Structure formats: C-alpha cells, structure tokens
Amino acid sequence: YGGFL
Amino acid sequence: ADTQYILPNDIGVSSLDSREAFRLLSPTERLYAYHLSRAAWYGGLAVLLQTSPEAPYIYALLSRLFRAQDPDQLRQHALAEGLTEEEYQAFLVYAAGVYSNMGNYKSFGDTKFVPNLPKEKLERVILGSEAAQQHPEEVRGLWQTCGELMFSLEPRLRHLGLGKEGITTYFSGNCTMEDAKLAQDFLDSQNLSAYNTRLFKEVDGCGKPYYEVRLASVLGSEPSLDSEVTSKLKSYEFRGSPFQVTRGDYAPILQKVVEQLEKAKAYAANSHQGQMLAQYIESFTQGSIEAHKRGSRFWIQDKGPIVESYIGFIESYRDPFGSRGEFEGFVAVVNKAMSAKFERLVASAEQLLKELPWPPTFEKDKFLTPDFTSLDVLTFAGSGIPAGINIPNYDDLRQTEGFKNVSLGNVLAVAYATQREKLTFLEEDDKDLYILWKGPSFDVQVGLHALLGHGSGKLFVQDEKGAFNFDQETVINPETGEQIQSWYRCGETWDSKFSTIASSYEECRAESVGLYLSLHPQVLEIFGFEGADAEDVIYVNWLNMVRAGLLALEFYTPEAFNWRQAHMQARFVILRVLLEAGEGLVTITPTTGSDGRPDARVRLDRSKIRSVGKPALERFLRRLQVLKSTGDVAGGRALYEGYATVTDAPPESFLTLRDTVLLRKESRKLIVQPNTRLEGSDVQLLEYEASAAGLIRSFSERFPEDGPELEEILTQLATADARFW
Ligand SMILES: [K+]
Ligand SMILES: [Mg+2]
Ligand SMILES: [Mg+2]
Ligand SMILES: [Zn+2]
C-alpha cells in the first residue's frame, strides 16, 4: 500500500 | 492555466535530499545500497512495458538522443533547427515527464501527456541529431514507430483502461473487463497470484479466443530446477475457454535485476537480508510469487536495518482490473531521529485499535509488534514516489508474520511546499491556518493511515474444510445483527474479490481511520500538540480532507464515469459522506475569482466536527470494515460506488465544480533522484539540478555500464508484443 500526497 | 494532456513548461521540479543519509552509511552498507539501487532502476524500466505500447520506444529514443547530446548540447542543435527556447523547454519537460513516470502517462491520474510543440519541428531535431548521425537506422526506425503515438490525442488514447476506449498493456488491446474477470476466476482456481502476470487474448481463424497468462521471469519455456512454477506452464480448460500459463516476461530486464541482487547479497548485514534476497532472486528467475512471499517474510523479520529496501510487483493501482502489480523497488536509509514519534505511536497502537468503530471480533486476533520507521530515500524506481508505504500486501503474511510501516522523510519535505497563492478554494483566514499546520497534520494522518489504517481489520477466511479463522457461532454482524453470512475462501484475496474498487476502497478506509482518530487528545500527544495547537491540527486535517475531495474531481472522467486515481476517489467519497451528514458541517459554494474566472469556496464548521462529523464518519467506517471483513463485494460496491457517484445534482453540482477544478488545477511536481557510482572501492553520490534538464541528466548517467544495451532490450521486448495493440 502506497501513500501519495 | 494549463491544458490537459500536456506538462506545463513551468512545472515544478524538486531534487531529493539524500546527502546526509548517504554520508552516514558504512562502506559495506554503501555497496549494499549501491547494488540494490542498480537492481531497482533496472526493474523500473519494465514499467515502460507496463504502461503503453509506445513507451518503451520513446524511452529508447530519448536515451539515445541525450546520450549523444546533453540538454545544453541538444539546445544548440534544436535552436539552430528553428525551435524557440519555449518549444525546446517543452520537449525537455516532456522527456523529464516520461523518465519520472516511466511512460507517457501520468502515474497520478493515468492520463496521457504529449510534447507541447509542433511534431514536425521535433522531427527535424531528432532526425538531425548526433544520435541520428551515429545510428540513422535505429533513430529513424524509432521515430517512425513511436512518433505518431507520441503526439496522438485520439479519445481512446487519452486514458488508461480496459476496453476499446482506453489504453492498457497489462492486457492485449482487445481485452475487456469480462476477460479480466474470467482470467481472475481462473487464477484463483489455480491458486496463482496475478501480481507478476499479464493477460493476452488471441483469436484463431475461427475467431475463438485463446488466453495467455504470462508470468514475469528470467527463465522461459525451457526446463528449470524449480518445479512449482514449471508444472503450471501448460494449457488449461476453464469454462470453455483455453488458458495457457507462460513465463519469460521482461526476461533480459529481470536478468539484470537478479545480477545486482546477487551482488548485493555479498554485502548483506544479516542472514535475514541474505535469505530474502535469495528468495527474490528465485521469484524473479522462476516467476514464483510464493518465492517472493517467502522473501517478504524474511524481510519482515529484518527489524530496524540501516539500509531498508523492497522490490517486485507490489502495488495494483494501475491495473484496470486491480489485481496485477506494477514493478517498483526502493532503497532507503533509516532516519533515527524522525523515527521517534512513530515508534512511540507503536507503544499506544494496541490501545488505539480498540477505539475503532467495530467489535474486536472484526479485528485481528493476535496483535503483532508493528514496525514503523522514518526513512530517507536514495532510490525509488517505478512510476512514482509515495510519501509513505505499508508493505507487504500479502494479507496472509500480514495476519501471521506482520508488516512494515514506512514514512519517507525526504519525500514528505518535498510535499511541504505550498505558497498561499496556490492554496485554492479556501477563504483568507483558513489559508493562514493551512500553512501553519499542513505539515504536522500530515504526520498525524500518515501515521494513523499506515499503522492503524492499513494495519487494522481482519478478513474472515474459510479454508479447504469448513473451519473458519473466526468464531462463526458467536460473531455477529453489527449492521444486520445476524451471524456472518459471507467470507473469503481459498485462493481469494482482497484484490481478487473487490477488483476495480479494491485499491480506492482500502485507501478510503485508511484515510477515514486517520481522520477519525485525529480527534483523539492522546494521539495529538504522541505527535505532541496537546492544546489549541492540537485542536488546530484537527481542523486543518479535516479542512484539508474536504478540500482534497473537491480537488479530486480532476481525476474523474465523466464520459467513462470512471475514477482514475484511488486516493483522490477515496477523498471525494469522504467529502460526500460528510456532505451527507448535512447540518451545515461542510458546504461548497461557486464563486468568482479576482481574475474574473469561475472559483469556489469550501466552508467547514469546526464546531460541528465532533457533534456531526464524527458520528457520520464512525457509522461510515463501521460499514466499510464489516463489508470488507465479510468479503461482501455486492454490498461493498453498492456503498462505495454510491458515494463515488458524480452528478451535477444541487446544491453542490459537482460536474460544474469539476470544470472549475480543472481550470485552477496545479500540476504535480517532478522529482529528481540521485545516483550512486562505484570508484572501484568507494561509492560516491551524484546529485543533479532541480530542473527538467537535471532530471534528464540523472537518467543519462543512471546506466553507465549498459545504457545502449537496455535501449535495445526495451525495443526488442516492445516489438515482440506489437501485435497485441
Ligand atoms: K487493487
Ligand atoms: Mg484497452
Ligand atoms: Mg511520477
Ligand atoms: Zn494508503
């Protein structure tokens, strides 16, 4: 799971 | 203003700050990080193949071009050929875009971007280039092949997606959502992961479709020492359809990868690192996800390493069906100081889980001591760089072994740059609070998003026999009051069941947990705000969430009724949930900007955050988890796709608002990453200018040993698959 912004 | 499907000339470019992190590394750790970085950058090139048919050619062309002439050398050629400085800058920005995305589509939005200059003028530059004089066949051949697709904005080429109106290379051009659903059912029936796979449909002379499930590996059809994968390499019959499982996808690229993984294993700090690397090598050589899962297990057990890393086909955001993984790899250095707050969050983690709006029966049975570190990135190869990661994604490993939470410090710093001029859709007094607290509130949200967000929740699973991982006799569904009716079965995963909304659904749940638990006075002490400061962080975190929901409309396609970005869709949904609560909590008003153009304002009554906002969020969060745990896909879709519905219904009129959001949108910045070079004995860090030219140079110097070979490899692999699109 990636977290952008 | 800026046109859709082009990158603006003045697009922001920031250089990753990695000097101090690299300087802390011992000689051995530097050699370790060096080879792992080489492995990651190698594998990142495969993303080009996973993006668009023309992407590998475009990279090959740009690489040849800038190898013979650097940006300043090419400028002298380009301007002598009739290009203005503005037109040349557009090409520089385009090239930097392709490099930073590993493709001519945005990783954040899945939209095509084209060079902002006349095609015929760019042709003169390329055909007259030094690269062209040295290899005229290669350059003219490349330009002939990818030139039209480089510029073409035909409607079906504008967005990534399955079917006839979108572009994807996870599937052959003729594949639809029906084909993906069929393939997924097949994959689940064979207990085969979709992560490292692609699906190709070819028809015979009778029009009967034949399906190819191709696994990513160094090895092809030839016999190998492994048996668990090679035994799967055969033909199948599934519901009348022929299915063939193959491998060898991106073979010479993955060959480069395992070469550098092997070399890295010579500098491993411990047996856990040595064993995880050997398993990754097995995974990429044979095409075994089971091997990659074994490696991931060893990786989880490697606690607090100086040089942290992960690599493979990890995230399934870009696969239109939502099960296949895009290649990524990162190398990062532990930041001892910044890891403090996250490690004490671990201390109060098990407690805070009980504050979540669902019974412990819907929570993981055995709580595991979580790993949460702040790291400084040296390398993040692939389509883009996240701010924080939560890995591995293998749910079985998550609920038995554990998982690592990572916050990327020097990435977060890049995102902490917002001039008040750019802070759109906010009244004056809210902008001031926004500037002060956007930074700290992010640390709060990200922390909860990672540890308590993605880390919470239990999946109800029934094995081969009628035994459950939960007490089916006493566990009651809080929403219905009945016993558990649905669950996950063998071969079924989160991605397999919820498919197209799996990513966005989970990000929404994670974001909700963060937003929900940000009201807790204790969590605002682990990060240490305590007073009105803590209260302010609350309001800003909630104001930022509802603003982002409005901004999210940029990433929605009305003609397709399709959301193009999981996180933004997730934030729009949360806006809709809060809007549903009514009672003047959140309002969106269409206004007129000082420039005379359409504008909007987002108003959030801070007094009604706890009285109205929390109960609405609590109810929403509960429903999310119940449906997720029970694998209730029908109920899950009905709930999520309901809130994700975009209409011009009053009073908000989102479709109208969207046109204003597009009008005042801000392009996301490009990030330049450093390189590491080996001076025989010592490892040096190479840094570059925070510009398009600087980003280009960083890739020009990225593969000094075998640059031209990689160009030929990418061209070859692309040509072999040309018939599919
Ligand atoms: K997914
Ligand atoms: Mg398509
Ligand atoms: Mg990107
Ligand atoms: Zn997330």
CA separation for the pair B693, B640 (Å, rounded): 43
Supply the DSSP string of B103-128, one letter for each residue. SSB-TTT-BB---SS-HHHHHHHHHT
Phi and psi of B528, rounded to 5°? 80, 65
Phi, psi (deg, nearest 5) at residue B320: -50, -35
Instruction: Determine, for residues A1 and B415 on separate chains, whether the beta-carbon distance falls below 8 Å.
Output: no
B413 at A interface, C-beta within 8 A: no
Interface contacts (A, B; CB < 8 Å): 33
CA distance B76 to chain A (A): 38
Residues 6+ apart with CB under 8 A from B676: B22, B30, B33, B34, B37, B378, B683, B684, B685, B686
State the pairing for strand pair A2-3/B388-391: antiparallel
Identify the closest residue of chain A to B413 by CA–CA distance: A5
Name beta bridge partners: B468: B462
- List, in sequence order, the alpha helices (H) in B238-389: 251-265, 271-282, 289-301, 340-347, 349-352
Q: How far apart are CA B18 and CA B3, in angstroms?
A: 33
**Which candidate, B193, B113, B584, B257, places its Cα nearest to that of B394?**
B193
Whether the Cβ atoms of residue A1 and residue B390 lie closer than 8 Å to each other? yes
A-chain CB neighbours of B409 within 8 Å are none
CB pair distance less than 8 Å for A1 and B384:
no
Q: Taking Cα atoms as reference points, which of B581, B513, B534 lies closest to residue B363?
A: B513
The contacts of residue B233 (CB under 8 Å, 6+ apart) are: B221, B245, B246, B247
Are B219 and B286 in contact, with CB atoms under 8 Å apart?
A: yes
Residues B488, B470 contacting (CB under 8 angstroms)? no
Gaps in chain B following residue numbers (C to N > 2.5 A): none
Q: Is B548–A1 a contact, with Cβ atoms under 8 angstroms apart?
A: no
| Tokens describing residue B635 | 């109920």
Cα B426 from chain centroid (whole Å): 28
Chain B residues within 8 A of A1 when measuring between CB atoms: 315, 389-391, 393, 454, 506-507, 510
What method was applied to determine this entry? X-ray
CA dist B56 and B719 (Å) reads 9
Whether B90 contacts B150, CB under 8 Å: no
CB B96 within 8 A of CB B8: no
Closest by Cα among B521, A1, A4, A3 to B456: A1
Contact between B346 and B369 (Cβ < 8 Å): yes
B249 DSSP β-pair partners: B216
β-sheet bridge partners, residue B216: B249
Helix (H) / strand (E) containing B516:
helix B494-517
Residue B156, Cα to own-chain centre: how many angstroms? 23
Tell me which DSSP letter residue B558 carries. Answer: T
What's the angle, vertex CA B519, arms to CA B514 and CA B525, rounded to 5? 90
- Residue B491 to residue B180: CA distance in whole angstroms: 16
Q: Any CB–CB contact under 8 A between B548 and chain A?
A: yes
For B386, phi then psi, to 5°, come to -75, 165
d(C-alpha B264, C-alpha B252), whole Å = 19
Tokens of B663: 């009008």
Provide the sign of the torsion angle of the four alpha carbons B722, B110, B617, B589, taken in this order. negative
Domains of chain B: 1-20+52-170+667-703 (no CATH), 21-51+250-334+372-418 (3.30.540.30), 171-249 (3.30.70.2600), 335-371+419-666 (no CATH)
Distance B199 CA to ligand 2 centre (A): 12
What distance in Å separates the CA atoms of residue B500 and residue B563, rounded to the nearest whole number? 10
Structure tokens, B519: 């009201």
Q: Which residues of B596-611 are buried (b: 16+ CB within 10 A; e: fewer)?
A: eebbbebebebebbee
- Rounded to an integer, what is the distance from CA B492 to the centroid of its chain? 22
**Which strand (E) or helix (H) includes residue B706?**
none
Q: Please state the three-class secondary structure of B169-234 as a single string.
A: CCECCCCCHHHHHHHHHHHHHCCCCCCCEEEEEEECCCCCEEEEEEEECCCCCCCCCCCCCCCCCC
Give the one of A1, A3, A5 whose C-beta lies nearest to B393's C-beta.
A1
Specify the amino acid at residue B308. Answer: E
> Which alpha helices (DSSP H) does B302-394 contain, by range?
340-347, 349-352
Q: How far is CA B208 from CA B163, B203, B242, in A?
A: 18, 5, 9
Tokens linked to B108: 């954040």
What is the sign of the dihedral through the CA atoms of B709, B711, B716 and B717?
A: positive
Closest CA of chain A from B128, distance in Å: 40
What is the distance between the alpha carbons of residues B235 and B221, in angstroms, rounded to a whole number? 13
Are B310 and B358 within 8 A, CB to CB?
no
Are A5 and B387 inside 8 Å of each other by CB? Answer: yes
Judge if the upstream peptide bond of residue B590 is cis by omega within 30 degrees of 0. no
> How far does the CA of residue A2 sit from the closest CA of chain B (Å)?
4
What lies within 8 Å, CB to CB, of B44 at 6+ separation is B102, B327, B328, B329, B381, B382
Amino acid at B262: E
User: Can you tell me the distance from the alpha carbon of B51 to that of B104, in angstroms, rounded to the nearest whole number?
Assistant: 8
Residues of B in contact with A2 (CB under 8 A): 315, 317, 386, 388-390
Using the beta-carbon criterion (under 8 Å), do A1 and B387 form an inter-chain contact? no
Give the type of residue at B511.
Answer: E
Q: Please choose, from the candidates B115, B68, B170, the residue with its C-alpha nearest in 3D space to the C-alpha of residue B711.
A: B68
Inter-axis angle of helices B85-101 and B119-127, nearest 10: 80
Cβ of A4 and B454 within 8 Å? no
DSSP state of B156: G
B371 to chain A, closest Cα gap in Å: 15
Helices B614-629 and B566-580 cross at an angle (nearest 10°) of 130
Contact, B667 vs B11, CB < 8 A? Answer: yes
Q: What is the dihedral angle through the alpha carbons of B704, B708, B711, B713, rounded to the nearest 10 degrees?
A: -100
d(CA B710, CA B639): 46
Mutate: best of B110, B567, B666, partner A, most A CBs <10 A: B567
How close B456 gets to chain A, by Cα (Å)? 13
Main-chain phi, psi angles of B108, to 5 degrees? -105, 85
Which tokens belong to B413?
């710093």
Query: Which chain A residue shows the shortest CA-CA distance from B392?
Result: A1
| Partner-chain contact B388 A3, CB within 8 Å | yes
Contacts B391 to A, Cβ<8 Å: 1
Q: By the 8 A CB rule, do B401 and B297 touch?
A: yes
Is the minimum CB–CB distance between B552 and chain A shorter than 8 Å? no
- Residues in chain B with CB shorter than 8 Å from the CB of A4 are 108, 384, 386-387, 567
Q: Are the C-beta atoms of B435 and B420 separated by less than 8 Å?
A: yes
**Does A3 contact B390 at a Cβ distance shorter than 8 Å?**
yes
User: Dihedral angle at the C-alpha atoms of B36, B37, B39, B45, nearest 10 degrees?
Assistant: 160
**Which chain B residue lies closest to A4 (C-alpha atoms)?**
B386
CB B521 within 8 A of CB B534: yes
Single-letter code of the amino acid located at B319? D
Backbone angles phi, psi at B169, to 5 degrees: -120, 5
| Complete DSSP assignment for B227-254 | -TTTTT-SEEEETTEEEEEEEEETHHHH
Residue that the structure tokens 């999981």 belong to:
B566
B326 touches A at CB < 8 Å: no
Residue with tokens 């009285």: B611
